[PDB]
Amino acid sequence: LKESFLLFDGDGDGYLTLNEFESLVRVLGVVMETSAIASTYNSNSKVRGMSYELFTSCFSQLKTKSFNKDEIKTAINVLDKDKKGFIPAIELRRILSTIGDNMEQKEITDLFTFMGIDEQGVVKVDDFINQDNHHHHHH
Amino acid sequence: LKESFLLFDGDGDGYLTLNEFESLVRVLGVVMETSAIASTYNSNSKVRGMSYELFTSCFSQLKTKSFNKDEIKTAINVLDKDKKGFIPAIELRRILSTIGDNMEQKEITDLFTFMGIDEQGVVKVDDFINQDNHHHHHH
Ligand SMILES: [Ca+2]
Ligand SMILES: [Ca+2]
Ligand code: NA
Ligand code: NA
């Protein structure tokens, strides 16, 4: 990963800025709110920025605290093999409980309420993934 | 402050996004790292974003945890009334110790080392304020 770190270190000093950190972690597959990524940066950077070894520690921890888009998609596709485009909201709740731990049950309900998803109904998978990316980028 | 909050709430739902929060807090005079602002947002927002009452609590706390540019400038100008453009680095250290508490002594030293400022020397005030704004925006 050192090659990739240094690639994203735009000024060649061995430290990432906050935008370079966010951009690298997203490139590497992390799916989560910008402010949560920024918060990890704030707690694990020196004045100069984030060094390679703080980065690998943070990146390991981000990786546990979240999922990637391959992971969510595989789990969704398992329940829509016919490609109808929809899954049950409660099965989405299961998946999101299962694959990353940056949502508790109460945060899932608040997310479903925000998006207009009923607990006994279905969710349109493309719209959900798109809205959730968008949400994450702005929060 | 409610009028200003709702002004920066771009979609009229009563909640700020992370960029609207950062932009409003900066407009209101807060001087501090983006990732520290983002970290406060991450800890004090619901799924929908940041409500007016979470905002006024956060904003009060940001205000204590930092300074504004009027505050630093007044304190600098007190030591350069002749407008030479320079102050002693140790007097800058005093000021930064004094007027916001998001720097400890060790973070001041690391900042001075980063900018090439010697402890027994002087600091060029315009260059310092400019570099520090820049630093804060990218970290
Ligand atoms: Ca760098
Ligand atoms: Ca809003
Ligand atoms: Na490490
Ligand atoms: Na409040």
Residue numbers in the entry:
A (entry chain A), B (entry chain A): 8 to 146
Reproduce the article's own wording on this structure.
EhCaBP5 is one of the EF hand calcium-binding proteins of E. histolytica. Taken together, our structural studies show that EhCaBP5 resembles ELCs, and the functional studies indicate that it is likely to be the ELC of myosin 1B.
The final refined structure contains 131 residues, one calcium ion, 40 waters and 3 acetates; six residues from the N-terminus could not be modelled due to missing electron density. Overall, the molecule is divided in two globular lobes, where each lobe has four alpha helices connected by loops. The N-terminal lobe has one EF-hand motif with a calcium ion bound to the loop between two helices. Taken together, these results suggest that the C-terminal lobe of EhCaBP5 cannot bind Ca2+. In EhCaBP5, the Ca2+ is coordinated by one carboxyl oxygen each of residues Asp16, Asp18, and Asp20, the hydroxyl oxygen of Tyr22, and two water molecules (instead of one, as observed in CaM). Overall, the Ca2+coordination geometry is octahedral in EhCaBP5, instead of being pentagonal bipyramidal as is typically found in CaM. The extensive hydrophobic interaction between these two helices could be the reason for the observed closed state of the lobe and water mediated Ca2+coordination or intermediate state in EhCaBP5.
